């Protein structure tokens, strides 16, 4: 499952995994906001390519 | 490791080789209450100082 | 063991 995989990637940078299971909704929200920011700094005329 | 179930009982195993062992307070740690984790499961954690080693 | 000999 995906949350159990995210917990191991947290464990791999030095943070424990209860930190991910406690803050799970906040982390999922921050990821969704960052993906949405990508997709409209791409749709504008900012030439990153 | 990971918590796994064989259908009836619950064990703890390492990730790249299946080798199930009994969940005691030596291979787990404690943090928090049972209402924040999404998907927590009711089982029992064995205390390895109380089989008979109460003197 | 050789401390919890209560
Ligand atoms: C799940 O694991 C438990 C523990 O290994 C199994 O219970 C054992 O079953 C064997 C039969 O082959 C008995 O000889 C043991 O005495 C049982 N252990 C205990 C502690 O009672 C259980 O059968 C397993 N279930 C499945 C579906 O594999
Ligand atoms: C996991 O275990 C706890 C108790 O160890 C369960 O909490 C009980 O839940 C029932 C119904 O939800 C209540 O009537 C009891 O009063 C609760 N006990 C306590 C001490 O508050 C919990 O529901 C269990 N979860 C599952 C999925 O079985
Ligand atoms: C798995 O999904 C079901 C819904 O299909 C849900 O009720 C259950 O809590 C989930 N188990 C987890 C997150 O461990």
From Swiss-Prot, chain C:
It comes from the Viruses. Subunit of the fusion protein that is processed upon entry into the host cell. Mediates fusion of the virion and cellular membranes by functioning as a class I viral fusion protein. Contains a viral fusion peptide that is unmasked after S2 cleavage. This cleavage can occur at the cell membrane by host TMPRSS2 or during endocytosis by host CSTL. In either case, this triggers an extensive and irreversible conformational change that leads to fusion of the viral envelope with the cellular cytoplasmic membrane, releasing viral genomic RNA into the host cell cytoplasm. This is Spike protein S2'. It comes from Severe acute respiratory syndrome coronavirus 2 (2019-nCoV). The lineage of its organism: Viruses, Riboviria, Orthornavirae, Pisuviricota, Pisoniviricetes. The chain holds residues 1142 to 1147 of 1273 of the full protein.
């Amino acid at each position: 499952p995906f949350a159990m995989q995210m917990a191991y990637r947290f464990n791999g940078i030095g943070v424990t995994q209860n930190v991910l299971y406690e803050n799970q909704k906040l982390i999922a929200n921050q990821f969704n906001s960052a993906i949405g920011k990508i997709q409209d700094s791409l749709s504008s005329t900012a030439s990153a390519l | 490791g990971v918590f796994v179930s064989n259908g009836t009982h619950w064990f703890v195993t390492q990730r790249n080789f299946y080798e199930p062992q009994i969940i005691t307070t030596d291979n787990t740690f404690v943090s928090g209450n049972c209402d924040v984790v999404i998907g927590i499961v009711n089982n029992t954690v064995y205390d390895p100082l109380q089989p008979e080693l109460d003197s």
